[PDB]
């Protein structure tokens, strides 16, 4: 027989810190190892590289994988859905304890490798393997892992399908059914219906926005709103700063496109930006006009900003990090005047990002925005679209994959509750064919 087990290690009580392990008989396939970036800020300057794994488990921070000492099997892989820190962030801190390769899609593999180049001299290390969407990699005789293309607030994001002798186990945390994306190709629907007909034993999926009604707005909407705010203005020569996730890439591409269309020169600031968009351009996921400038260290940035100041803000579009009000982020540094560029009345600050619903980040962004307003700035908030799927996206996902079991992951118990109600609309039953797991719990499927 094939006894499948699903062990919840991280992120089913919280949003960050995601880690799941799928045990097929005695083989283990681990998916995702993220940091929880909120409850690290509760403590007074931690500097995550000064701490080793255990420290951070009693903060968590990183998922408590000690519970993996109680499970009956050996891990053969560490798969990663995409390159957000809530998914690949814990790798350089925990993956070394496992004698297993790290499988990911190219952009992720690259960014992982870049992050480990800060773990220490080496680590152990695991060998890092790049697998693209649409391709499949056999890990043992009968266990084979497949990558299926999807969209998310990061480029190159993927469904993972673990084929076993008794069927496929697909895990889909962090997706979005964007039918008209700015980057990448539309999600592989035909493959989802087909693989649905092949046989899915279990579905593990995010419940982030399952309570939200309807279907997720396309990234094209964010594109159009940003177009509207940048170009559709009767105060053309003001001085505009755009801030967003350094990781989003699709949007940054939209923004530099816009800069080329609105006759400004796009300058990208911050280590964050340099890493993500740099790695993106180098690996050819985005094209850049020859005029763009990218600066990471404080000297490059501040120099670029004195320059950008005295030559005229009207003829520039700084694109940067700091949308959640991170002090030390370039925007936080501009708001505090710890920079040559010092904003004046009329100046437009464009936040192409949501406010993360945590008191820490909300306080930070509050303080940031008031400092900006006292310096006369005019703020455009939340010109943004969520990269997570809504109720209807989930509904149709259930209707094409037709999974035999469903396990909500990547969220709080309330998010999970919303998802549960939706799945119950689909014919499922709690504790029977629909399962609510907590961090540290293992659910068995038989036969």
């Amino acid at each position: 027989s094939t006894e499948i087990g699903i062990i919840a290690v991280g992120g089913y009580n919280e949003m960050g810190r995601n880690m799941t392990a799928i045990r097929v008989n005695e083989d283990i396939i681990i998916i995702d190892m993220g940091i929880r970036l909120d409850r690290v800020q509760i403590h007074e300057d931690v500097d995550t590289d000064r701490m080793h794994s255990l420290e951070l488990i009693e903060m968590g921070a990183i998922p408590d994988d000690t519970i993996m000492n109680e499970v009956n099997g050996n891990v053969r892989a560490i798969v990663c859905t995409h390159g957000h820190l809530d998914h690949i962030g814990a790798i350089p801190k925990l993956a070394h304890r496992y004698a297993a390769p790290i499988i990911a899609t190219p952009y992720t593999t690259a960014l992982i490798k870049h992050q480990i180049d800060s773990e220490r001299k080496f680590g152990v290390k695991n060998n890092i393997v790049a697998l693209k969407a649409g391709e499949t990699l056999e890990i043992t005789k009968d266990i084979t892992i497949e990558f299926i293309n999807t969209q998310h607030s990061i480029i190159d994001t993927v469904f993972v399908a673990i084929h076993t002798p008794s069927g496929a186990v697909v895990y889909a945390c962090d997706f979005k059914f964007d039918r008209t994306p700015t980057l990448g190709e539309v999600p592989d629907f035909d493959r989802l219906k087909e693989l649905g007909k092949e046989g899915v034993i279990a579905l593990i999926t995010e419940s982030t926005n399952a309570g939200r009604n309807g279907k997720t707005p396309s990234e094209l909407i964010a594109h159009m709103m940003l177009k509207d705010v940048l170009l559709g203005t009767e105060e053309s020569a003001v001085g505009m700063i755009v801030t967003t996730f350094a990781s989003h890439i699709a949007r940054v591409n939209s923004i530099v496109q816009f800069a080329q269309e609105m006759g400004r020169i796009p300058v990208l600031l911050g280590r964050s930006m340099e890493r993500y968009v740099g790695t993106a351009y180098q690996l050819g996921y985005i094209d850049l006009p020859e005029n763009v400038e990218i600066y990471g260290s404080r000297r490059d940035i501040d120099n670029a900003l004195k320059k950008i100041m005295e030559a005229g803000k009207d003829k520039y579009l700084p694109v940067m990090t700091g949308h959640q009000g991170e002090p030390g982020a370039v925007l936080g540094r501009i708001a505090n005047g710890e920079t040559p560029f010092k904003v004046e009345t009329g100046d437009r600050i464009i936040f192409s990002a949501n406010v993360i619903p945590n008191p820490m980040t909300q306080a930070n962004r509050y303080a940031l925005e008031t400092k900006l307003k006292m310096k006369g700035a005019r703020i455009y908030d939340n010109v943004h679209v969520s990269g997570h799927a809504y109720r209807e996206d989930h509904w149709e996902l259930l209707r094409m994959l037709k999974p035999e079991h469903v396990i909500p992951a990547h969220g709080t118990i309330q998010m999970h509750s919303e998802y549960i109600q939706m799945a119950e609309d689909a014919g499922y039953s709690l504790g029977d064919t629909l399962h609510l797991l907590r961090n540290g719990e293992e659910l068995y499927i038989e036969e």
Copy 2:
């Protein structure tokens, strides 16, 4: 013995008065009066459909003005017995009921013509050809955007094109010997509309530099941060939910504001795009979109069917049920869960249409933030969900201006005074903070008026 100091004095003219009679304590029931010394211009006369439904039965028909004034409902113009002048005109911004709803009930007491843009005028006369008073009269005058009409020698009225949740909507500029008084309730700076013309920015700048004595403007979304999304966004989202689906042949009902001609036009475009026959239900839509098509503001495929009375609707809806929902797209009223509206009674099954599991109900409208309509819409959605429907909420974009749109409006008109209208005191508070950023001062250059109040501006 000595010491000095010097100040220039004079010299002296125009006593302008602004009468807040309706829609300054609440939204809707809007009425403002612009008094230029001796002469008066009435702007907007709206109905408030909110605090009439709180009472057990609405009627609104065989009732005369006074009763609705103790409900309000209609603006209390009794305070106009206290003003020193005669109204020589009644202008209307656009054809929403919070703006023209009180006309067939109050405009008759005033010996003045009603000036509006063609579509508005049309809907006005259609409403008077329905209240049935027949009547003591007014001339209904059609003035299009971009044109100007002299009414009293020194008083001249200009229409300046803008966008809003209904087609053909306009800024009104009351030119006086000492400058312009601009009234801009219900507007939005949509630079990429689906219908109509882009708002006339250049004229706004010109008129700004000519001299604006006062700006009267809505504060509905002045608290909302940033700039209002284009209607194109609503178009793209609707396009996304109707076409972008992997459960294609289900049976889909779309509900929206009957007045939002642009949105319904987008929708029939979509039905034409998805091979369903667009059918429009409700007396209300036949009213609005019928008037729109007759006057040629929207183009319609001949595939369209429009039905107003219950018999036409219930039978067309038999037509669609028995023939198959798959090749049809009903667009309807009832988005606020109005009982008696076609959708609410469909939800109650008081109709041939029997909605089934999987069916998609698409609300291209927001929930009006009032406990009544929130309750009705709650009940509606639970009936629909229990009968298995799949609900797409708030596929919608606000037709009102945000903080930054107001910012640039102030920066183009550069008015000497500012008056928030069309909202609650809190909405007005947000607007006040915004204008305070713009250099204005409360009780001096920016004024918070309440219903029934007059501020005198003495300008030379």
Copy 3:
């Protein structure tokens, strides 16, 4: 060749089952079944008055069980055709309709006696002497707090005193050969009540140490932080608003839950204290407080007047209007803005009572967090405010237990399993987090059940 390891095995008995049939997806409509192998004990059978009013007309009278099951309304006991045992009793926690409301409609299909505490039993028989089925029968048995009743040799039922928003309310403990199953829906640890006895802590500790196999308990306010305020707080606040006023002779109406005997007792004490004659209106109050006084749970001054039918009420209310509101204190129903309740129709003026400016309306009740009742209460308060009334909101204290009260409940009973009931999945989620702090584990030692679901505990 070698190596070792050792584990003790066995030995083996009691298969206990817990049936969640009602009130696990919503609040109210509560029904749970405790199956001890072969025998079944039904606990609570409540009505849900929420999702019945969403439909146009309530009736509830000439309807039989099934229809109300597709509304629910009443708990779906159809799933009891699938269980392997016979119910040999029906216990009721207290006399709120979310607990005993479904009895005259479902208890008849079960060949079992209905066990309750005296006041509850009384109200039950009063309700069956009203549904009018006459009927196929059950014996209505009065078991007081602190006493125990053997029903099936190994199954014995204990009543343990507690406090709650209605007088004489009880923990139920189902003793079995292998331990106790405690059901505690609707409770509160009030250590200083105005009425009743302080909850029986010592017995809870004893029974905790004896062995509790399962705890089934409400999660209504498990999300609320801290510990529930005593009823004494509600008493002191009411004392504060009624007596503590510098506008003394106005005319004051107090509205509250008819079931909240303790609160009304406080109020009549106050009327007796402020020299007004306490008059109680509504069929509902005559029901509850009448039953309370007849059975001697509350003492009443002979000044009191209690009127149930419209004629008595409208005339007593003529009495009070024409004689002067100043020397009277009407206590009434209608706090949720129920149209047809005496207060709502007073607000509509469908009554001799004509409330005037200055008059005080005192709501000793919370707003039930549902859009329907929130809308009704909105409308009520606006009618009252427009007619000049002065409104005192939420002079109230919740009758349900908070997080910390639950904490100590777990720490006294030390149950082997925990099951949240009586709430939504989110309420249950909060409770789950609380119990997880207590050492419990989801799907192992703490179970989230939905309506219609059974968890088997196999205990030796």
Copy 4:
């Protein structure tokens, strides 16, 4: 004639930073000078004594009184309602610019004098005068200032009535009609009705809780709830910490009373506590049992806490500051483990205070509470009653004083909006007999 002017200097746009000036012809009476304690925390360690007035005005922080250079009169007094920092906090920083005495009720005068003993070597200084409730002090021939007793979250809090040739101008920011107080005497109602009949030209009053329905709960309610939580527990020997406003005094008195009734020894920790309750006991506003201990510096506190730890928490009730999660406050220091006393599972933390509705303090209190919960603590939140008046308290205030004009103060424009609606119920009219002022604006009353 007598032309009265009311100049709004601070706190009508915000809550903190209160300052009003009443000009009677050419004489000026200033009431309140507070700090805004929120928007000082937006900046990175300010240390308010390192900055002089102007610094803080461009932060504000302290009220911008530069606008007082444009008014036609000379100030003859600086009156203070009570000893909260939103009322007397700006005195040592601005009062030196004015050649005028500072009048207050004894507890305030004391605490003011204690605060100036940190302004510098001296300052100028103004002479500080103690005037009790019920007594009157003539400041010029015809202008005389009266103190009328009321309750508020601080002991000895007062209505100020400025009698002039044309009537009284009463300012009542921060009150509460507590008819059954724990401390002090019930508000002087008879005097309010009487003085109402004498003639009030203008009423300046707080709008903090005017939107809140009904009448403010008595302090007796907070007393009873605290009694219930401290005594009504079936886990008697756990270890309980009580945190509250060091300034409240009434509640601290309740708490030590309770400690005496529940057989624990009351220990009070923090500079804040020592100052406020110490000054209170010394001036005889509260009685203390002989057993109590008060410790202010880190050494006394930490020593007391090691002591209190090893001897047994069961036999102790630490009462302290830190309810808004101030890092450096004793509770914040306990939650971070920067103290000998280190909380364990079951321990009860009792917050007898509300959460101040500002993102800064909400974030701070968030972080605090999560640290406490991770250490196993069980939290009792908001066992508290607001010290501000509600709609009905305001209503009856209007009905006994019968003021000819009303000006809401001490709040945001929305609070002011709520108050406006209530006053309109009372017959008043905006811009005519009811006035909405902003910071920096002067309103004239004639005749």
